[PDB]
Amino acid sequence: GAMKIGVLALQGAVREHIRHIELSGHEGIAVKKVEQLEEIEGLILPGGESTTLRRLMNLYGFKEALQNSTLPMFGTCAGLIVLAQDIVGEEGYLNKLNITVQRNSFGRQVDSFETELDIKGIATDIEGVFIRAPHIEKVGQGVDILCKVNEKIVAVQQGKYLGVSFNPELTDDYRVTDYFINHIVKK
Amino acid sequence: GAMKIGVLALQGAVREHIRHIELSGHEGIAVKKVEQLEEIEGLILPGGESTTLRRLMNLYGFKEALQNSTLPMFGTCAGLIVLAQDIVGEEGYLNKLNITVQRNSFGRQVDSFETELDIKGIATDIEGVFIRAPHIEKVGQGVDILCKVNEKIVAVQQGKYLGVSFNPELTDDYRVTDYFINHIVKK
Amino acid sequence: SKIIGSDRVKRGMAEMQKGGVIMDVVNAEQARIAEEAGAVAVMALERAGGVARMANPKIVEEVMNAVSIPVMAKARIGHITEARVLEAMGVDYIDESEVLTPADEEYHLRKDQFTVPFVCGCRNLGEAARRIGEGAAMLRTKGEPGTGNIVEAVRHMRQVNSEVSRLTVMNDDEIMTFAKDIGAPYEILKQIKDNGRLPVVNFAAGGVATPQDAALMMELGADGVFVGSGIFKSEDPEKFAKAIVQATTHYQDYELIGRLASELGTA
Amino acid sequence: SKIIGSDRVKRGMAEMQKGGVIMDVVNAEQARIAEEAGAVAVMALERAGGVARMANPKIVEEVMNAVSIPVMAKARIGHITEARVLEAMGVDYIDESEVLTPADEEYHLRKDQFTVPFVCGCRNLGEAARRIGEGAAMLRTKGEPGTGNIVEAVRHMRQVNSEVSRLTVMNDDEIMTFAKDIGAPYEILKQIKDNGRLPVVNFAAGGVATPQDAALMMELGADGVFVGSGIFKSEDPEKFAKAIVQATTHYQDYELIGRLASELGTA
Amino acid sequence: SKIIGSDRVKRGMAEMQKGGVIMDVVNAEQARIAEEAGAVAVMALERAGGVARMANPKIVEEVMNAVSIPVMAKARIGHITEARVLEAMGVDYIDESEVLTPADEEYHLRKDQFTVPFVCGCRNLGEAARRIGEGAAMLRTKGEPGTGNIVEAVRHMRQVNSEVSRLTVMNDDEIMTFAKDIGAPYEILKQIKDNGRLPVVNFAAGGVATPQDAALMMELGADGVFVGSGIFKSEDPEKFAKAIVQATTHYQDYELIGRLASELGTA
Amino acid sequence: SKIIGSDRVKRGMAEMQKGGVIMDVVNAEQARIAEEAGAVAVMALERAGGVARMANPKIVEEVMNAVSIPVMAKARIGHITEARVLEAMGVDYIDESEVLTPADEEYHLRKDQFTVPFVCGCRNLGEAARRIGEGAAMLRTKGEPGTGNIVEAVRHMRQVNSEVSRLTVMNDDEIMTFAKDIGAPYEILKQIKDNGRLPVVNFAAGGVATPQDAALMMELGADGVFVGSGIFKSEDPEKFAKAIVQATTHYQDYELIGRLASELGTA
Ligand SMILES: NC(=O)CC[C@H](N)C(=O)O
Ligand SMILES: NC(=O)CC[C@H](N)C(=O)O
């Protein structure tokens, strides 16, 4: 019934993800220590600064604990970067999604935007907010491409792993977290 | 499941009765107009001034509506006076409980008190607060005497009608309202 | 056993009094009208012209023997023996009233020594918390008695309500100096924030003179109305008191209030 | 469907009222004269001597049933239940009037909660913008009621007119601190500059007592005239009200105004 | 379509920035350390001795090309062309900073005309609401920059937090005059009470100099920490910035903060 | 079971500390001298020249591992995370010290949330009662630290002693307003009068610099002596500290104090 879903509370919009978890009818846990990973059935890597998030995960055993964990994951911006196997110009981190992603494909904040997104299998009018968002350059075998914007894909799903370039937590539409919890963690 | 219980919100401790209803797992409705009586499955006549309560009920059709209503009732102090068929020195009002009750049997407020009460069928340590409370002088046929204090009975139950001289709403113990809702209204 | 005098009993006597109006009274025949009009209690009293004292015990007993609703009498500020005499008569409530000429311009009564509950006037959270600390079991607004002007009652009610609402959501680190700023007992402010509401019942008192500004007090957050002698200054005190009761209990039936105001027609 | 209560309806009730004069009224027979004299509406009221309240609903209904033109009644400042009772009676406009003794010396009414439009007094762009923000749907000058001295009406009208004219051509960079200086809602000032005029109708009210200074108000920029009881203090209230209507509608026919003034001859 | 410049995007750029520390930077090699230490953004700047202006676009571009985290630059108060030039360079945030010598001692920038979000300093709910009304998309405490004394940051944070907490539970009737008292736009206060929190992110800025009072800011309610040049005034700026990041993210692991403080050892 | 953190334990840690002197310490070898001189505890610290913070945890651990007597460290006023970090290290006492630059110029620490006892400075019964209400488990005089002038310590000790002696025999009717006059929690004053003494231990602190004015503090009513620079600014700290201990324990053996003063001979 009521499932406990964790949000990596190292840095970023953790309150918004916890609120969206509570909107889906579940309990949210802001995880800051590795031990809390043993108390949740799902993990959301929230939006923030991928550099800061990497630096924080590398210092408390989070990288080794999450590289070896069998927990399903939902990465937004930065979280998608952290989940990718390869990063253009840098190196892959958690190596969970067989994709190659480039950081800051659009302009800087003076070029961030909002739009409507038709995500395959969720909804046809998701309110997507792109804030210096990355884009997925290449996909591997077994990676479903859920949503693209101008031939540049931004939303993918590989089995029990879900990655998006936009940040749905900043909106009042909680359908993405609902889909993640009810069709990935509940499977 | 969740039952709507009404409290006569003409005068008296209505907030406390609504709180105790909410503590029992049900919804409370502060009834001030006769029409609201059609929306509740049970009625609580709260503690207050019996004179003011009579004067308010006589002026909005509440006396005729409640004398003809088939709704179960729970009267505390004043509410017990209003529910009685006979009142020493005065006249009976709603004529719901076949009992004769005397108002202000103890002293004035300089003689009000608290005590422990062993109510037959509820609990053995109810926290009873008597504030210029009446006492039931005589009982009729079919009136169960639930609790007495100093040979003066103060808690009775006749079928779907429950009367008490004390005010349990002023305490944190909500067992009396719970018993009323679960064993009288739910019957 | 018989836990008589517990604070819960003192403040429950007034907590199960809210929703009604207490009108003051001079003689037994006015108390008859007050009772038969729906008043929850009567304020027995005798009378910028001199020094006001306690109402003679004879008149208080005359008012007491005439009604079955609770009767409360007024005592001078800090007057120990006056409140003690009112307690000996069995009076249900003593009003440590600033309307009467005070007896101790510095120190209020030691209300927690008595077994009879007290009601005191307040204009902000500071005075209210101080009265509660001294042992008061009920609060009212100081207002402007004898003027029919609701301005002061509104001001005091809104002030104390806004201050307690601020305190209910105030940081725990900031409460202490807050108690230092408004001159209030600190533990009482902590209890206010813990309970989430004012630990005692606060009524309106002062400029209430029409059904409109009697229902306005309940609309503003007051739990009841203290009405002065203006009731017996109209052409028909019976209908006036009845309309005040109706407007106090149904403070949001505006057509009812309009009809009651149309019925009345005096100053 | 039925978009009832939209701000456009509230302020249109007064926007299609400009060009005429609203004279106050005490009884039905004065309302007859007001209607048959060309008044666009009547101000139903009952009366430095005491505390002024709402006019008894009986007299307001007596004035209401006597005329087909809109009737408006006065409510005390910040008096919630008074304005609510006037709303329940169907009164077309409530004047949150500072002439009556206020009820809340700190906070005005929450006018946007009501479905009946309100009219409030103002002396500068600050008070006007604050009243508009609180939900007022009409504005008038505070003036000096009961004196017949037009000085205060002229002063307030000219002040608010000069301030809104300044704001209509004021730099966008300077508006915010301007709103901070006059104590006004900032979005309302932006809307003022965007629309180019005052977002609501501003009437004259106070010292109007002759046709001359009734036409002077329209010459100064007012949209209408609020006239007090001085009409029924003359030798012929009918001719006086008729002349006031004529001078308000044709405020630049000076020979007509001269003839009307020659006809009249009282204080 | 492509709703670029919408307020939600402006303030989301900072809302998904909370939980981290923004340390200022002078040259590219300091920005490298800031990025590799866990900073969420860098404040590009050049330097009681003269008049401070914008940091030369050359040095801002040098800092920009060295890091992938967002870089923000400082502009003079009310300096239109300075903020416009910083916007043309693609700077992620402009700080309408009171640290630099102002350019308009009366009127702040017209921040809602820009498509780049702004961050402004505040000391109470009044200044914060005024900055939000002018179009600011982020707030920080004014503090006492260049002193290492946390007193002013604590004071401003606690003041604005207590005031917004008061407003979240404040009566709807009293808000307007409240906005008049603190000199704030009224609609912004209504939106504050409706949302229940401050409509934008408020960071700490000023006296932050140790990990202890960096975690204290997060304990007090701040969403992040603005750190000055003191990082590069220690013996090891890398370890200092790393410890500040650690204490900002885990502001309640007190043994961790103790170890980080033991490691550091400078002024 | 294990009733850890009860107020009786907090204040007993200091109640079984009276009769001895706590001298502050910078490094391990000075703590060695302090222990070998008869000190009951040491005050670990690191240092009108800047902003004073917490003493680096490294130096506090260095002092901790060097002695078996309790070691106490200083935290900034209202600094939550500083006191929490000192608590995590196992420090026996935290001094919410006004000597260090404060962190919250308005609100003191929430001392009753901690499980480690606190010591605070006071200058009158008001400040003492406020600190106790906030949860302090020990009191000292503010004095004039770093001056060697005993005037302020004498003044504060005598003031608080005279005020508590007045309260011990003060009328029950007058206590409440008394608490209002000195700005103190009322229940704490009632507890003071009930116990007949100050509910916690009050030490001397500040101008102590010779054995004479160290024994004078015990003669005046102090329970112990906090010594600052009086020992670690002389030519011979060992003999100086030994003489201070002797004069503190035998504060009425005047020939002994004279001999100890003859031995010493510096500023
Ligand atoms: N998540 C964001 O704020 C986007 C920018 C960030 N530097 C990143 O690419 O991870
Ligand atoms: N309910 C009470 O407050 C008790 C006294 C009241 N007059 C009565 O007997 O009804």
Numbering used by the authors:
A (entry chain O), B (entry chain U): -1 to 185
C (entry chain H), D (entry chain I), E (entry chain C), F (entry chain B): 2 to 48, 56 to 275
What text comes from the article?
Here, we investigated the biochemical, structural, and dynamic properties of the enzyme complex responsible for vitamin B6 (pyridoxal 5-phosphate, PLP) biosynthesis in S. aureus, which comprises enzymes SaPdx1 and SaPdx2. A multimeric assembly of two enzymes, Pdx1 and Pdx2, synthesizes pyridoxal 5-phosphate (PLP), the active form of vitamin B6, as well as its vitamers. Pdx2 has glutaminase activity, converting L-glutamine into L-glutamate and an ammonia molecule. The latter is delivered to Pdx1, which synthesizes PLP using ammonia, ribose 5-phosphate (R5P), and glyceraldehyde 3-phosphate (G3P).
However, Strohmeier and coworkers observed that a mutation in one amino acid from the catalytic site of BsPdx2, H170N (H165N in SaPdx2), stabilizes the Pdx1/Pdx2 complex in a fully saturated form, enabling structural analysis. The phaser found a solution with a final translation function Z-score/a log-likelihood gain of 18.5/1565, containing 12 SaPdx1 and 11 SaPdx2mut. However, during the refinement, an electron density for the 12th SaPdx2mut chain allowed the tracing of the chain, although with missing parts. The model was refined in Phenix.refine, and the final model was validated with MolProbity. The final model for the SaPLPmut complex showed remarkable structural conservation of the SaPdx1 dodecamer with minimal structural rearrangements after SaPdx2mut binding, as suggests the comparison of Figures 4D and 7A. According to PDBePISA, the 12 interfaces among SaPdx1 and SaPdx2mut have an average interface area of approx. 1424 Å2, with 23 hydrogen bonds and ten salt bridges, supporting the formation of the Pdx1–Pdx2 complex. A glutamine residue was observed in the active site of SaPdx2mut. The Nε atom from glutamine interacts with the catalytic cysteine C75 (2.3 Å), as shown in Figure 7B. Unexpectedly, for one of the 12 SaPdx2mut molecules bound to SaPdx1, the electron density was observed to be rather weak.
